[PDB]
Design a protein around this ligand. Structure first.
Ligand SMILES: [Mg+2]
Ligand SMILES: [Mg+2]
Ligand SMILES: [Mg+2]
Ligand SMILES: [Mg+2]
Ligand SMILES: [Mg+2]
Ligand SMILES: [Mg+2]
Ligand SMILES: [Mg+2]
Ligand SMILES: [Mg+2]
Ligand SMILES: [Mg+2]
Ligand SMILES: [Mg+2]
Ligand SMILES: [Mg+2]
Ligand SMILES: [Mg+2]
Ligand SMILES: [Mg+2]
Ligand SMILES: [Mg+2]
Ligand SMILES: [Mg+2]
Ligand SMILES: [Mg+2]
Ligand SMILES: [Mg+2]
Ligand SMILES: [Mg+2]
Ligand SMILES: [Mg+2]
Ligand SMILES: [Mg+2]
Ligand SMILES: [Mg+2]
Ligand SMILES: [Mg+2]
Ligand SMILES: [Mg+2]
Ligand SMILES: [Mg+2]
Ligand SMILES: [Mg+2]
Ligand SMILES: [Mg+2]
Ligand SMILES: [Mg+2]
Ligand SMILES: [Mg+2]
Ligand SMILES: [Mg+2]
Ligand SMILES: [Mg+2]
Ligand SMILES: [Mg+2]
Ligand SMILES: [Mg+2]
Ligand SMILES: [Mg+2]
Ligand SMILES: [Mg+2]
Ligand SMILES: [Mg+2]
Ligand SMILES: [Mg+2]
Ligand SMILES: [Mg+2]
Ligand SMILES: [Mg+2]
Ligand SMILES: [Mg+2]
Ligand SMILES: [Mg+2]
Ligand SMILES: [Zn+2]
Lengths: 31, 60, 50, 155, 207
RNA sequence: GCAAGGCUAAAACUCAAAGGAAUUGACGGGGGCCCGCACAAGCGGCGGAGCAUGUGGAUUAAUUCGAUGCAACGCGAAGAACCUUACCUGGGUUUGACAUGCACAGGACGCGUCUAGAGAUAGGCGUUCCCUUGUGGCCUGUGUGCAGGUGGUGCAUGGCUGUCGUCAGCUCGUGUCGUGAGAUGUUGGGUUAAGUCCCGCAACGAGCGCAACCCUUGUCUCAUGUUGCCAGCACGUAAUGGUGGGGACUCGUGAGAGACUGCCGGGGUCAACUCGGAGGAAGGUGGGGAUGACGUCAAGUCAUCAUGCCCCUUAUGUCCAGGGCUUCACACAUGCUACAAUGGCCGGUACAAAGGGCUGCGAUGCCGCGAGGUUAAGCGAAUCCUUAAAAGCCGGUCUCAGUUCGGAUCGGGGUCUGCAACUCGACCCCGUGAAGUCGGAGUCGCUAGUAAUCGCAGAUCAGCAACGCUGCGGUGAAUACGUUCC
RNA sequence: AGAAGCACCGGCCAACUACGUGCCAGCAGCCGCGGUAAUACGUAGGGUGCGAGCGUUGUCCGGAAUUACUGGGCGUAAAGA
């Protein structure tokens, strides 16, 4: 079940990218 | 069943219609025969033990 | 019913065979009535006189 | 079932008529075990018939059965997302039995008083080609011909 | 359980009824006191190690055969306890009784005694894992034993959860009708409850 | 870096794991082979109506308790008016209905009568046989350890049972392989209903299983002859083997024989086996039953019985009268009758099997429309009764109608049992004559003497809600090309 | 004759039965115990280890070859840009 180790990383990276896309503007570009 | 009840069944109750029969061995009030005087479970295991004569299984 | 409780569809069958025989001895003799009376019958066999 | 076909049951020659189809049609008619009753009914149908036929009654009944014999039925099958039917050829022993089963089923609902002459006029109008089972023949036939396009799924 | 009695099976095929008599009308009140006499002889006499009890009854003369492990205790000082059980049987049956305590020719191949030995030792609270093995060894020293299965079920040493395990050796064909298989079942009494001990012993096809 | 973002890169906090390989199973809307009324082809049903019964719910004073997918629900319960009964109201009681240990005291008891719903309370008769001479028998009275418990826990238990499933698998010892869990044996090619068998192989063997041994049915031989049978004789009363009589037959029931791939043809390593034939009553397991491997469900049962712990003793013990366990706007489950002409009715007329009978079967005759009533012969039964089996055949009427269908429903009158029939029994007669015109979604059973349909019998049982359960026989089917699908 | 107490007793870890409690009180380092029979909570008895000491905390090293010089690893366990 080595793919599980990839899925956890995938979900964490996906949520981080989703947060960055939620804030690619003065929400975060100012900061 | 209960000891008072087996004593009552063994006694002579008034109004003979009231008289019934229990198991000869455990006092079960139901599934008791007359030619056997003996309930169904306490007839099954007794006959399996062969301690009452003339009895066996069947196949027809 | 096999089970003590709740199972109708499981049963056991127990039966009784009683086997009958006749002989009908004919010739009567006085000295054999006592012989017929003094017979060691086996334990499970019962005899009638007619 | 699983282990090949099951053996069929032989049916002996009729005493009144040296023919087997009478013996088998009566058994089709049979319900609840009145062989005697169904047999007198079949015989009464043929013996009522001969007056209005002139031809031998079993000859007339063969003429009817040749009419109402199926050839190709509409047996169902589901393959993908939609079930449909498959035109399949019917072997004669199945076909005759199906035909006279239709005869019995639609003679149980035909409009006269009682089933003796009900079946009697059923036999004569099937020998003349006008009856209810007769029209079922060429409606089941056309239903199967309209699905011949699916004959290429023959299991 | 799901196993029927091998005695119930082979009753009339291999083994014989324990009681042989004939009756038509007073069979019911013979059975009434037959159950009583079995209660009597099984109550207060467990030390002798009962094996089995035969009953014969013929026109007001009854014969009670008893096979036990030790004919010593029941007889006592030349008839101090045999006549005692005779008297407590007379006052029960109202009938002159020929009581015959014979023997069991060997009390270690005869099931319904292996079970009681194991049960008494369990009541003594020593390891059933030695008990069943010594029963195996004692039951494989006779000239005629082709198999024995011992099965004990219960808490088995103060366990909170019961368990039923069995040992066996040789062949014990409980599905074979021509198989002389003798069955015993006894209820071991202990501090935490009751332990079922059931033994099947196979003594050949038939002789 | 234009941006997207990339690179470098922590800590606080949180968890006792996260992980990698491999093993055994389980599962897959994975693959292959196969089997099962699993589908398919049919036959008949349920879900619709009424009723019977059980259950959920509700209500009550109680509606005892248990059973709750299959595998609870016509189940425990193979018989609840009393009883059963474990429930409630009340009248009592309280070493008790019952068993044993220890102390003081001597008839227990039985008939019959009064009151009391009865339990019981009281008059009075009968009164300790037995050396109650300390000793023997029993008993109450007073107590004292108890007895008792259908009171809890089946998730502490034994015993019994269901279920997967009568599915053919489950394993074991020795040896070998692997660090190990484990593996092999038990895989591979065939074959079978079957881990059934043959050939190969680090496997060699064995056990529980399958099979057979057991019972019933299907043929034949020997002996057998009453209560059974009547072929050749006689008798035949009333022709009812009724009689003498006979071992022919049946039948009864004892011992047996026969079915074992036994023989021949073909295929296959010449194997397991396989297709087809001869003989044979029965052919490949002749049919059915009994049979439930290791285990699973902490499955059911503490209410058959037994039982470890917990709980009451002027009460959960215990006796008795009543009522309740049978209620009722609903819901589910299993059944019986129907909704007709393959039928309704009238009349005549055949052909069984299996069981039951002394607390009994009630032959005949008579009375009553009938349930039933009476006299009474014979019979513990191959004797006599049950007993006329019913569906079936013949003839006549009815003519498609809510009817000459249906028989719930009601009134009235009754029989039998039982002390007792209102709560709450069964059966009979007259008149009354509901729902029901074939039942939606959905769902069940069945492969042959089967479904279906028709009666008969039994256990329990005084009587019975017997349409429930287990059995017996009459008539008696239609379909199964086949495994795509469930 | 004036002079002993402390801790602990399921495994590590040496040392066990009973009664009271019944997922409550509570114990515990770890994994776990207690939901009616607790060798694991409170008490008693016994016992063990100590002893003018016995336990709890905190700190550090060891065990930790879990920063490996002695003395480790990076195909799939973390680890080849
Ligand atoms: Mg078998
Ligand atoms: Mg990983
Ligand atoms: Mg893996
Ligand atoms: Mg795997
Ligand atoms: Mg699969
Ligand atoms: Mg079948
Ligand atoms: Mg179908
Ligand atoms: Mg309905
Ligand atoms: Mg209930
Ligand atoms: Mg049923
Ligand atoms: Mg009552
Ligand atoms: Mg259980
Ligand atoms: Mg090794
Ligand atoms: Mg295997
Ligand atoms: Mg293996
Ligand atoms: Mg084998
Ligand atoms: Mg349970
Ligand atoms: Mg339960
Ligand atoms: Mg109890
Ligand atoms: Mg009462
Ligand atoms: Mg009830
Ligand atoms: Mg008639
Ligand atoms: Mg008359
Ligand atoms: Mg007619
Ligand atoms: Mg009518
Ligand atoms: Mg209507
Ligand atoms: Mg109509
Ligand atoms: Mg009855
Ligand atoms: Mg009764
Ligand atoms: Mg039948
Ligand atoms: Mg230690
Ligand atoms: Mg405790
Ligand atoms: Mg402690
Ligand atoms: Mg510390
Ligand atoms: Mg270090
Ligand atoms: Mg440390
Ligand atoms: Mg390392
Ligand atoms: Mg490297
Ligand atoms: Mg990695
Ligand atoms: Mg690279
Ligand atoms: Zn009993």
């Amino acid at each position: 079940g080595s793919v599980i180790k990839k899925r956890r990383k995938r979900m964490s990276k996906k949520k981080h990218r989703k947060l960055l896309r939620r804030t690619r503007v003065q929400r975060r570009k100012l900061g | 069943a209960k000891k008072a009840l087996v004593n009552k069944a063994a006694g002579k109750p008034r109004f003979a219609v009231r008289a019934y029969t229990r198991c000869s061995k455990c006092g079960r009030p139901r599934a008791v025969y007359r030619k056997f005087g003996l309930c169904r479970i306490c007839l099954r295991e007794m006959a399996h033990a062969g301690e009452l004569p003339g009895v066996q299984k069947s196949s027809w | 019913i096999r089970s003590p409780h709740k199972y109708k569809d499981s049963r056991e069958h127990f039966e009784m065979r009683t086997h009958k025989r006749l002989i009908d001895i004919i010739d009567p003799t006085p000295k054999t009535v006592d012989a017929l009376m003094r017979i060691d019958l086996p334990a499970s066999v019962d005899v009638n006189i007619q | 079932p699983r282990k090949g076909p099951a053996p069929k049951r032989p049916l002996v020659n009729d005493p009144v008529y040296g023919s087997q189809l009478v013996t088998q049609l009566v058994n089709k008619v049979l319900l609840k075990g009145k062989k005697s009753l169904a047999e007198r009914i079949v015989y009464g149908a043929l013996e009522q018939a001969r007056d209005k036929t002139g031809t031998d009654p079993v000859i007339t009944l063969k003429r009817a059965l040749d009419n109402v014999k199926p050839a190709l039925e509409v047996r169902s099958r589901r393959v993908g997302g939609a079930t449909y039917q498959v035109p399949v050829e019917v072997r004669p022993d199945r076909s005759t039995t199906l035909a006279l089963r239709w005869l019995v089923g639609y003679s149980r609902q035909r409009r006269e008083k009682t089933m003796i002459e009900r079946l009697a006029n059923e036999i004569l109008d099937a020998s003349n080609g006008l009856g209810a089972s007769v029209k079922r023949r060429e409606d089941t036939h056309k239903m199967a011909e309209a699905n011949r396009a699916f004959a290429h799924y023959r299991w | 359980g799901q196993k029927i009695n091998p005695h119930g099976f082979r009753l009339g095929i291999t083994t014989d009824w324990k009681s042989r008599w004939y009756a038509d009308k007073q069979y019911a009140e013979y059975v009434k006191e037959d159950v009583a006499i079995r209660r009597l002889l099984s109550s207060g006499l467990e030390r002798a190690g009962i094996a089995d009890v035969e009953i014969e009854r013929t026109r007001d003369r009854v014969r009670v055969d008893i096979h036990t492990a030790r004919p010593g205790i029941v007889i006592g000082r030349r008839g101090t306890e045999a006549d005692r059980i005779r008297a407590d049987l007379e006052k029960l049956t109202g009938k002159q009784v020929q009581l015959n305590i014979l023997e069991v020719k060997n009390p270690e191949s005869q099931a319904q005694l292996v079970a009681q030995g194991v049960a008494e030792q369990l009541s003594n609270r020593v390891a059933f894992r030695r008990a069943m093995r010594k029963a195996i060894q004692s039951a494989m020293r006779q000239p005629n034993v082709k198999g024995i299965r011992v099965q004990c079920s219960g808490r088995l040493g103060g366990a909170e959860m019961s368990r039923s395990e069995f040992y066996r050796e040789g062949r014990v064909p409980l599905h074979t009708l021509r198989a002389d298989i003798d069955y015993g079942l006894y209820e071991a009494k202990t501090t935490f409850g009751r332990i079922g001990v059931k033994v099947w012993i196979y003594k050949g096809d038939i002789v």
